[PDB]
Amino acid sequence: AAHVIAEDVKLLQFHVATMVDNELPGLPRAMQKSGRPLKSLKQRLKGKEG
Amino acid sequence: MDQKLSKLVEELTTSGEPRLNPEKMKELKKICKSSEEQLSRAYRLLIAQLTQEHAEIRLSAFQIVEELFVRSHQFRMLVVSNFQEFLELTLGTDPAQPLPPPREAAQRLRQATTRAVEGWNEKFGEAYKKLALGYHFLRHNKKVDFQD
Amino acid sequence: DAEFDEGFKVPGFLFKKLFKYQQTGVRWLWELHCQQAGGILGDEMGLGKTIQIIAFLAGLSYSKIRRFEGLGPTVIVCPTTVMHQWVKEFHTWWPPFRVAILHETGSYTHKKEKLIRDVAHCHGILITSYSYIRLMQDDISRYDWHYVILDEGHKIRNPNAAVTLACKQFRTPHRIILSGSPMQNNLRELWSLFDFIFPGKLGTLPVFMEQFSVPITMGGYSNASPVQVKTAYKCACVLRDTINPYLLRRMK
Amino acid sequence: AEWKILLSPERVHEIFKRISDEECFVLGMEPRYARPEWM
Amino acid sequence: MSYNYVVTAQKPTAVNGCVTGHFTSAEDLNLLIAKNTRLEIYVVTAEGLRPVKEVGMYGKIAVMELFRPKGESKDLLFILTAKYNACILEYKQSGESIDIITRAHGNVQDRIGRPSETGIIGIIDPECRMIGLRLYDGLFKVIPLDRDNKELKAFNIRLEELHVIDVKFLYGCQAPTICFVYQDPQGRHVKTYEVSLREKEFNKGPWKQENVEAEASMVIAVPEPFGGAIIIGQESITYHNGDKYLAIAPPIIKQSTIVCHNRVDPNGSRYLLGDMEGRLFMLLLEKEEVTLKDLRVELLGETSIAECLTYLDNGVVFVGSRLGDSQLVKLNVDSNEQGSYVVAMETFTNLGPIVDMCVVDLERQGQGQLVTCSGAFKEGSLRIIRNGKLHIRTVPLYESPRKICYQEVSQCFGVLSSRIEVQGTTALRPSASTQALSSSVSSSKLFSEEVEVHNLLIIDQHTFEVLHAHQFLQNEYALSLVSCKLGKDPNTYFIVGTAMVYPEEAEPKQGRIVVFQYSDGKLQTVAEKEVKGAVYSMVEFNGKLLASINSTVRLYEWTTEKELRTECNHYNNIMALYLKTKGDFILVGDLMRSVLLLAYKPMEGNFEEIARDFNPNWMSAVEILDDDNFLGAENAFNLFVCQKDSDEERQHLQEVGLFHLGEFVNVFCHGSLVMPTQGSVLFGTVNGMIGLVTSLSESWYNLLLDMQNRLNKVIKSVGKIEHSFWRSFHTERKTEPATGFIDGDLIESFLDISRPKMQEVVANATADDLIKVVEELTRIH
Amino acid sequence: LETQFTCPFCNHEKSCDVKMDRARNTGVISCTVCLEEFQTPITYLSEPVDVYSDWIDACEAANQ
Amino acid sequence: MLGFLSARQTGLEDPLRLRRAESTRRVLGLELNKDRDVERIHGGGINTLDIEPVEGRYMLSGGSDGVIVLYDLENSSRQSYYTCKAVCSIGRDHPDVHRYSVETVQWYPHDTGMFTSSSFDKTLKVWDTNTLQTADVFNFEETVYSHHMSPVSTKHCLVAVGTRGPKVQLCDLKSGSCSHILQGHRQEILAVSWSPRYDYILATASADSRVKLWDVRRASGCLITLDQHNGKKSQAVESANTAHNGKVNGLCFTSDGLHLLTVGTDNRMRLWNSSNGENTLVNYGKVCNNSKKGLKFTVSCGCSSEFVFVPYGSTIAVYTVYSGEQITMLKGHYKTVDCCVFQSNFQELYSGSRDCNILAWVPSL
Amino acid sequence: SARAAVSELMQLFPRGLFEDALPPIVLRSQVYSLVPDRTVADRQLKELQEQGEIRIVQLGFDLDAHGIIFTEDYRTRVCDCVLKACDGRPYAGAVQKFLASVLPACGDLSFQQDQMTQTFGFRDSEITHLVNAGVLTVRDAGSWWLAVPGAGRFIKYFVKGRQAVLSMVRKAKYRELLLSELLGRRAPVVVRLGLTYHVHDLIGAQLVDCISTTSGTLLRLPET
Numbered sequence A: 001a002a003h004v005i006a007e008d009v010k011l012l013q014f015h016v017a018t019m020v021d022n023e024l025p026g027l028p029r030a031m032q033k034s035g036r037p038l039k040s041l042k043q044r045l046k047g048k049e050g
Numbered sequence B: 001m002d003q004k005l006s007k008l009v010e011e012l013t014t015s016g017e018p019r020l021n022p023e024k025m026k027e028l029k030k031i032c033k034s035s036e037e038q039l040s041r042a043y044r045l046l047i048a049q050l051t052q053e054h055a056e057i058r059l060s061a062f063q064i065v066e067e068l069f070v071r072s073h074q075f076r077m078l079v080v081s082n083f084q085e086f087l088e089l090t091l092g093t094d095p096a097q098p099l100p101p102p103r104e105a106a107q108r109l110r111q112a113t114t115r116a117v118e119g120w121n122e123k124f125g126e127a128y129k130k131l132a133l134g135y136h137f138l139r140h141n142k143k144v145d146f147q148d
Numbered sequence C: 001d002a003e004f005d006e007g008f009k010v011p012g013f014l015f016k017k018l019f020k021y022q023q024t025g026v027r028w029l030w031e032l033h034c035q036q037a038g039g040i041l042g043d044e045m046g047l048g049k050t051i052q053i054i055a056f057l058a059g060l061s062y063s064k065i066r067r068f069e070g071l072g073p074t075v076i077v078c079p080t081t082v083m084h085q086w087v088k089e090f091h092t093w094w095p096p097f098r099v100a101i102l103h104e105t106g107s108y109t110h111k112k113e114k115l116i117r118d119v120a121h122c123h124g125i126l127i128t129s130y131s132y133i134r135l136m137q138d139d140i141s142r143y144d145w146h147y148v149i150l151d152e153g154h155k156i157r158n159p160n161a162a163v164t165l166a167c168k169q170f171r172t173p174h175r176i177i178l179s180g181s182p183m184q185n186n187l188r189e190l191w192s193l194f195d196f197i198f199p200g201k202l203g204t205l206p207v208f209m210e211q212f213s214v215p216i217t218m219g220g221y222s223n224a225s226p227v228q229v230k231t232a233y234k235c236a237c238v239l240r241d242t243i244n245p246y247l248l249r250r251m252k
Numbered sequence D: 001a002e003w004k005i006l007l008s009p010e011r012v013h014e015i016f017k018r019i020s021d022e023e024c025f026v027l028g029m030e031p032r033y034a035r036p037e038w039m
Numbered sequence E: 001m002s003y004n005y006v007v008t009a010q011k012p013t014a015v016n017g018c019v020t021g022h023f024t025s026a027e028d029l030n031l032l033i034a035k036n037t038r039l040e041i042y043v044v045t046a047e048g049l050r051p052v053k054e055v056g057m058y059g060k061i062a063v064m065e066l067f068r069p070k071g072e073s074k075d076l077l078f079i080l081t082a083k084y085n086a087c088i089l090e091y092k093q094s095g096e097s098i099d100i101i102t103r104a105h106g107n108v109q110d111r112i113g114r115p116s117e118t119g120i121i122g123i124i125d126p127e128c129r130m131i132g133l134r135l136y137d138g139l140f141k142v143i144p145l146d147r148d149n150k151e152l153k154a155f156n157i158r159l160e161e162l163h164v165i166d167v168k169f170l171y172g173c174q175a176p177t178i179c180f181v182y183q184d185p186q187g188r189h190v191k192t193y194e195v196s197l198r199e200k201e202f203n204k205g206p207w208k209q210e211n212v213e214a215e216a217s218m219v220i221a222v223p224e225p226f227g228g229a230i231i232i233g234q235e236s237i238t239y240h241n242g243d244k245y246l247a248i249a250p251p252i253i254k255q256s257t258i259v260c261h262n263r264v265d266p267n268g269s270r271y272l273l274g275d276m277e278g279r280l281f282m283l284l285l286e287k288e289e290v291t292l293k294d295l296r297v298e299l300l301g302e303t304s305i306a307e308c309l310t311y312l313d314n315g316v317v318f319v320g321s322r323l324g325d326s327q328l329v330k331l332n333v334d335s336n337e338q339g340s341y342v343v344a345m346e347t348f349t350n351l352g353p354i355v356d357m358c359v360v361d362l363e364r365q366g367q368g369q370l371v372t373c374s375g376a377f378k379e380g381s382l383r384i385i386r387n388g389k390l391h392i393r394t395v396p397l398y399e400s401p402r403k404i405c406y407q408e409v410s411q412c413f414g415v416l417s418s419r420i421e422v423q424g425t426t427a428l429r430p431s432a433s434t435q436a437l438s439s440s441v442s443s444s445k446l447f448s449e450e451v452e453v454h455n456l457l458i459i460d461q462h463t464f465e466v467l468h469a470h471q472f473l474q475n476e477y478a479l480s481l482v483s484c485k486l487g488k489d490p491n492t493y494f495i496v497g498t499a500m501v502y503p504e505e506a507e508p509k510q511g512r513i514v515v516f517q518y519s520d521g522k523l524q525t526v527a528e529k530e531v532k533g534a535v536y537s538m539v540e541f542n543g544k545l546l547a548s549i550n551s552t553v554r555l556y557e558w559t560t561e562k563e564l565r566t567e568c569n570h571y572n573n574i575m576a577l578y579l580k581t582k583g584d585f586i587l588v589g590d591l592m593r594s595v596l597l598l599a600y601k602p603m604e605g606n607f608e609e610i611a612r613d614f615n616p617n618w619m620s621a622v623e624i625l626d627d628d629n630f631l632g633a634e635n636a637f638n639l640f641v642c643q644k645d646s647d648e649e650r651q652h653l654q655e656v657g658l659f660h661l662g663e664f665v666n667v668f669c670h671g672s673l674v675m676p677t678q679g680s681v682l683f684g685t686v687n688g689m690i691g692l693v694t695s696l697s698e699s700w701y702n703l704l705l706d707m708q709n710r711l712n713k714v715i716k717s718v719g720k721i722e723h724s725f726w727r728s729f730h731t732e733r734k735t736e737p738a739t740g741f742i743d744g745d746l747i748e749s750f751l752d753i754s755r756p757k758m759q760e761v762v763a764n765a766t767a768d769d770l771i772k773v774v775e776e777l778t779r780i781h
Numbered sequence F: 001l002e003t004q005f006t007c008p009f010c011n012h013e014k015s016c017d018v019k020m021d022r023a024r025n026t027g028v029i030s031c032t033v034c035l036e037e038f039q040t041p042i043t044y045l046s047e048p049v050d051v052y053s054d055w056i057d058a059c060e061a062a063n064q
Numbered sequence G: 001m002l003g004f005l006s007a008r009q010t011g012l013e014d015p016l017r018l019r020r021a022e023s024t025r026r027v028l029g030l031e032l033n034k035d036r037d038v039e040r041i042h043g044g045g046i047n048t049l050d051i052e053p054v055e056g057r058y059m060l061s062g063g064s065d066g067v068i069v070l071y072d073l074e075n076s077s078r079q080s081y082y083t084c085k086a087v088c089s090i091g092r093d094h095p096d097v098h099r100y101s102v103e104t105v106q107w108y109p110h111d112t113g114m115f116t117s118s119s120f121d122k123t124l125k126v127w128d129t130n131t132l133q134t135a136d137v138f139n140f141e142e143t144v145y146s147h148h149m150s151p152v153s154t155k156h157c158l159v160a161v162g163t164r165g166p167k168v169q170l171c172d173l174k175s176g177s178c179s180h181i182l183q184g185h186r187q188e189i190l191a192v193s194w195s196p197r198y199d200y201i202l203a204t205a206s207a208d209s210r211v212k213l214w215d216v217r218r219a220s221g222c223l224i225t226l227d228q229h230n231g232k233k234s235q236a237v238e239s240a241n242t243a244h245n246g247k248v249n250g251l252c253f254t255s256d257g258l259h260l261l262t263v264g265t266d267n268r269m270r271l272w273n274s275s276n277g278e279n280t281l282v283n284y285g286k287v288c289n290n291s292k293k294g295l296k297f298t299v300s301c302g303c304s305s306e307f308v309f310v311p312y313g314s315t316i317a318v319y320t321v322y323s324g325e326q327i328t329m330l331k332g333h334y335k336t337v338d339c340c341v342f343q344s345n346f347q348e349l350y351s352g353s354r355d356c357n358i359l360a361w362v363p364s365l
Numbered sequence H: 001s002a003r004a005a006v007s008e009l010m011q012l013f014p015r016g017l018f019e020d021a022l023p024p025i026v027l028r029s030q031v032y033s034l035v036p037d038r039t040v041a042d043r044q045l046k047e048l049q050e051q052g053e054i055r056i057v058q059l060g061f062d063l064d065a066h067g068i069i070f071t072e073d074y075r076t077r078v079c080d081c082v083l084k085a086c087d088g089r090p091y092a093g094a095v096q097k098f099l100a101s102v103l104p105a106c107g108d109l110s111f112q113q114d115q116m117t118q119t120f121g122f123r124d125s126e127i128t129h130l131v132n133a134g135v136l137t138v139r140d141a142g143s144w145w146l147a148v149p150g151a152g153r154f155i156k157y158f159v160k161g162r163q164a165v166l167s168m169v170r171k172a173k174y175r176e177l178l179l180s181e182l183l184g185r186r187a188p189v190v191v192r193l194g195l196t197y198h199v200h201d202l203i204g205a206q207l208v209d210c211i212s213t214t215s216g217t218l219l220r221l222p223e224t
């Protein structure tokens, strides 16, 4: 379906983007156990204690 | 003999007279009675003038059209052909194409065209089924107040 | 010689050996071929189906029916256990056919890809196991095959198995499935089967679940409500109506 | 892509991939270490 | 529901198809002539034709071609039926027994399709490999012969050109090849194709298309020595062979189009051509070493209008005519001192299209006597019928009659007659109107290539000679005619409704009712009445004149001033063409609404639509059988019987009997040719068939229906064609099984079958009672 | 608040839009698919959702 | 016209000649109702009309306001001028009225004892002619733009349904199995039609702007792929590659199922051969459509030359199918026209528009 | 015949305006102007295109814009100008291969990737070479239309000229005007291609009503 493939490419795009940038405006954070999000390659090297 | 017709309708329309000048009105009557393709030429003049953006000009054009309608038979077929667009430009049924200013001229046009449609339905309505359909369509779909 | 509707002739002596039910099955199968749709042989185990398929194929080639004149390069996906049985039966019943094995045992002793190419260019009946299809899916699915007979295809009941997606690549419409039990755990197997033979008939998979899997399955529970039982009965009747033409299921 | 058309990555890659070396050098993408379609 | 019985008073006589060949035996030169449903087998003797068999097809014979497959001793016969019943037949004579066996049979009708303008065309490849049929536009049905079918399986090869004029199978072709002329907006063209049975599709022709004469209307397949084919135009003639392009323009053919052809020589060096006018021509192909050199056209002479002709041998040519009497002629080597090499050898009587007919008890006997407007343009003649077998007389007119009526008081026939003039105007031949004892010209004040002229011919009803011929105005068509006395004065008049015909209007808008009185050998113009339209029909109605203007039926009154005065009008009619009367009831035959039972109310003095049928049938006749049983014959060769039903529902007439007569009923008329059944109405037809329809009783109808079922179960049709299907009511958009009718011919055939067959039929009373009953039924005719 | 509403007749979501002619104190709502058009006065407090809800009552009230 | 009668009586010309010549002459002289008037019952525009196949008497009609009205066309009165009453109605108070505009309504062919109807409420109800009660329903997941039952199948009774989803449903009326879908399109499906000649050949067109002739027995998607330019190369099954440059919202097989007429929102119509989908380059000029939903039109039958009655703005435009001539324009409506039907018995046309009118065009003289 | 009509219309092309860099271009609509039978016009144009005398190119400015160009003008101008301005830069050879292989073979309007990759052995690099030559432009991913280099100038001038002519007809009385009056009138500077050229285009596309009057053919705007 056009809308199903729309959603699945949306999901593949989402996974790549949250792989290099998790904290996006409006979009949900990639989730993980213990109630916390993940940490992307941009958080590894953002600021103090980066 | 086309220049004089255009001239005459030009004075009748552009003057913005509240009432038609009867002498050149009679000249137009006689000269149009001369020929039928010339009657169509006068019809085209009237249609062109009606589109132009001024309520008084449209009032003058509509009054001329009513005169010819009541007076001529072929003119009746010719106008009821495009009765759709004619009603659109005179009644302003499509809100996307309102009536230009002034407001007084627009209201006078509205009243006069309502009455003219009523009279035409009374007179030629059976003779032109499309006129009866248009009357009914105005009366219900657009809900035009014929008692106003 | 037995004469079918349009032009399908099978040799009379070969027709004679067949039983009543088998020749009925041959007629049904050729009708399926006329419509250009797939099908499943639902005959219970041992009622005799390899004979049916061999008879139909031999008659088709013999009939010279009209890309392909008569029989084109087919393929028979079979479990490894019965491959030499297949070769023996083909040789016994119709020895004209060239049957070449695509297996490590095999009879080629060269590059397999050469064997597939040669069979494709020779209108031969290539037999193979599911493993080669899963592995050689690139090479198998390029030769414009004619038939894709699946022996004991119920292996394919897993819709997303690599073998399933591998075998669902052949572009021909003539797909045959041989299994006396073409449903073993639940309706999803049935769905995948009719996905392989006739992709459209049952809807897309989630639609199929919602439309039949729930009203049918859930209505069979011990605690089923009578109204729910009637609902399941209705849907089961409807589904049997739907799938009737494409299963030929005779019991013992 | 509004004038509201959802533009796709493949469209983009094809468009960029045709850009010549000179126009991208003009844009500032140095053509040898940055080619706009590797984005 | 109603009960009726039709029967053949006289079999059809016109010929619509004739082919010569060796069918009875390999050596026999057989001449087969296809009368509409009678296939007459003759043997071409040294003199005349020797009859050998006549048989009854259950189908209007549309196609008839003789062909000899490979290995076949004598030619096989392939015949197609208008209802698309296909049959291949073989002649098997078992000594005295002549057994026309059905080799292969079947039906070839497509479920939906626009039946082609030029009618069914059936052709066979010269090598006898397949049969090509063109039934519907855009498709080309192909029936292989090599694949021996007992069912005549076929298949369709789509044809990118949709308006084909003609098609033929070219000679000298390794693969089957078709040439056809087709019409497109660009003009008329010619193209060729190659049939490929294995592919079931065409291929590129041996040679590409070409632009032809505008009216190229025939294609003639030349045999192998010359190859190619010959196109005959209205004006020019051409020959193509892919590269050879021979063209001629002999002016002699320009006057009339060439309608028919036949090859003379086995090599095809000689061809015959006949026009509508009946002039017979010769086309002669000049060879050169072989190839074609030159085309030549020469007038051999004139004959009856030849719908189809075939050279037999020895200069003997059979002229099959649908319009006039079929002819047998001798082609002389030398002209007959009039430019004519043809001399008539034999004439077979053909009641031509019976455009109108009237019964008279001439000689004041107890026996009826029919006088018919037979014939056509040049073959126009009157036949007179009596029992003596059916006696036939003849009275040539050399011009087409249109209506006839009898004035016993005047002892003459009012016979509308019409002739054609080419130019003011010039008559082509001396006809009855021009040869009259006396004549006059209408001079009316109401109104003020080749053209038609109408005349009213007053004919002695003793000597059959033209007592008078009052010619009508220029461009006036005398449509309907009636002999009667109106109002209260005793003068019986001849009333002629006419119309003003001009090429510029499709529908005549101007016509006049003219009342004449024939007295003292002279036709006096008693009165006139202008009307605003043609008068398609008038009829007396209780001392009044009921006339039929274009779409308005009105009642006219013969005033004491001897003038017509309208009383009332009725307008709910498309075109009120046919009118009949019984008491206060009228039966109006609309052009497509099929009936309108109009009952005249005298206490008011107007009309009332008592009822109407809403099935849109296209009428060709109408007649009232009883007070509440109405007969009507539609144009598609069917009979339907409408009966008053039993609210507004009472207004709906009901079609109770449906029947496919297979002929075009031109006219009904009450009467009987002879001195259990009730009423009697005779009808003529286009093919010269004369028939009789009568009522029955219920128990008799049931019995006869059962007998017909038994006969169908017993009697074996020619092409294995089921009788019920043959008589099934049929229309382009409808098909119903026959009811309420008892086929006369089948029952009357009860006699000519052997006793075991009666006992089989009468397996459930005795056979002798049925023999008596069928004899009684035979009595009425 | 939002401005596009399901057409009450052709049931196509977000297919109706509004034009508030504040000059004439009249707002128009028109279904692009079925071309249905509803006219009604508006005041300086009115909003599209207020206009739309006049239409539904007009539909139901006439549908009585 | 008298010449035709002479030729017919004399047997010169087959009666076929007169019949088809007169039918054409009637179709040419068509014009607005002199002697009919259709009773007014619809509060909204009329979306569809369907004159019955057999006897051509009764005429369903599906309003934009959810009501269905069943008409009678035969002049039961004794006057020359009359009106077409309404026999019954699925009014708004009936317990089974559609909640929204009725988009398609079709008699059951082979028997008037039934009629099918569809609506934008995602339902396809199967009524009874006589008892007038919805003896079934098929509920769908998206709005139903059009449906069509096969006009010739004596064997199968499938009902193609083109909805806003890209899947062509094939419901059956014999035991109801609405599972079947034809995979391949890409967007909404605005029209579907069954061939009149071949039982199983279904031609659907979608807003993604291509028409695709399926065979519903096969398992190989579609057969033919209609392409404006009919170039050499071939393609797989999608809605792509532009039968028209815009939405295709119209289909009609010509009278005997050979060709295939398609109007589309790019203001063009095209006549395609339906054996090989070969655009036959007839053109028809500029025919104005901008309807966002299905567009119904018809072709004449039993006339010497074949016409097509295609809505054109608020006017019906008559073209000759094979030649492209614009024969005339019928100008009698005030809003856009949406469906026209043809009465092959008497060569009459009925037209329904958004202005809540059903006009009758009858031949003059 | 359409062949004549395209010939005369090609004569009207002011080659000097485009410094003979662009081959003369004729719009299909103008072919409809001189040949009223629209269907015959299309059939005969298809006939010519099959024969290989002309090429049809999607000009893109309107979906119904198909430009008609003689094949030899196309080859001459492309070889001359492209190879001259591009002597040395690589795509000259690729364009030579294209003109040698594809254009004589298939006259099709669009080119799809599979055809060039397989039937013609063109690579992605060579396809990009063409695209930069101006000879191809992107229809879709992996799809491209044939094109004339430099067509943008002609397209811009044609668009402005068409709208200007339509405006001039609009501003005449009735929105009407006689054809002779228009042709004799002094052309606006915006109308760079000549008035007869644009008038044929307007008439052919039914943008202007052609009314045959006693004084000649009048132009009237159809009522919108």
Ligand SMILES: Nc1ncnc2c1ncn2[C@@H]1O[C@H](COP(=O)(O)OP(=O)(O)O)[C@@H](O)[C@H]1O
Pocket (backbone or CB within 6 Å): C017, C018, C019, C044, C045, C046, C047, C048, C049, C050, C051
């Ligand atoms: N008419 C027959 N003649 C000879 N052998 C037969 C016949 N029918 C079935 N058989 C044999 O029965 C056995 C089972 O048939 P097979 O198709 O191999 O298994 P299944 O019936 O489970 O598919 C085979 O060995 C087959 O040769």
Ligand SMILES: [Zn+2]
Pocket (backbone or CB within 6 Å): F007, F008, F009, F010, F011, F012, F015, F031, F032, F033, F034, F035, F036
């Ligand atoms: Zn809506």
